[PDB]
Amino acid sequence: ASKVKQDMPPPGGYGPIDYKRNLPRRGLSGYSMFAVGIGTLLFGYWSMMKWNRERRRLQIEDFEARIALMP
Amino acid sequence: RKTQPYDVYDQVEFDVPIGSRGDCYDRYLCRVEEMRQSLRIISQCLNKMPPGEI
């Protein structure tokens, strides 16, 4: 006298299944991104200004060596 | 499935995606949302399968 055994859902019910779109925001603000970009640009401009002025002085020294040697 | 239902489609709940512009983007969005609604229907079918002969 065996009872009916059959593939059925468990008692009560199966756990809820997610189906809605899940796309998080995941970012900074536009103002912050622009501000970081301009800050990086200004730091680069200042560094390049110093280095190019030093390069100009070094080139002047190199040219003076040639002027001394030319005669 | 909504207008002329067959089998047990009248006993499940789901939304029908609708587009606005009639282009490829709207149809792509419709198909993605239909995949989501199929997941919804599958969950309902899993929780509502009755016993009996096949």
Side-chain angles (χ1 to χ4, degrees), chain A residues 1-24 27-71, chain B:
Chain A
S2 297
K3 76 169 323 303
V4 156
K5 177 47 172 153
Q6 194 183 29
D7 199 33
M8 293 279 297
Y14 277 118
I17 294 169
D18 290 12
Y19 62 88
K20 285 162 189 281
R21 163 151 78 202
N22 193 5
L23 292 195
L28 277 169
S29 171
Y31 298 125
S32 290
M33 288 179 222
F34 286 127
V36 173
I38 323 280
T40 297
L41 283 181
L42 300 171
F43 173 75
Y45 293 164
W46 188 75
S47 287
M48 261 318 168
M49 188 195 346
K50 279 195 299 203
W51 181 224
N52 273 351
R53 281 173 191 167
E54 174 57 4
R55 282 168 87 198
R56 289 318 284 265
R57 290 183 288 259
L58 291 162
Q59 188 197 53
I60 287 162
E61 178 188 27
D62 207 292
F63 283 8
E64 277 164 359
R66 164 179 178 242
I67 274 165
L69 288 175
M70 272 176 88
Chain B
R1 291 172 286 165
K2 288 287 183 60
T3 67
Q4 301 166 8
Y6 47 98
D7 277 350
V8 288
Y9 268 119
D10 50 320
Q11 319 191 27
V12 288
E13 298 292 62
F14 65 102
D15 310 326
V16 173
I18 301 293
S20 295
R21 312 185 101 251
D23 56 342
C24 298
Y25 191 68
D26 273 354
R27 292 184 275 269
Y28 151 81
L29 295 172
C30 275
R31 293 197 172 91
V32 168
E33 187 46 43
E34 261 143 47
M35 269 194 280
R36 309 195 171 272
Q37 299 300 319
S38 277
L39 268 181
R40 187 172 174 190
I41 303 173
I42 285 172
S43 70
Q44 291 178 72
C45 295
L46 286 171
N47 281 319
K48 271 174 136 188
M49 185 92 51
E53 80 286 355
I54 67 165

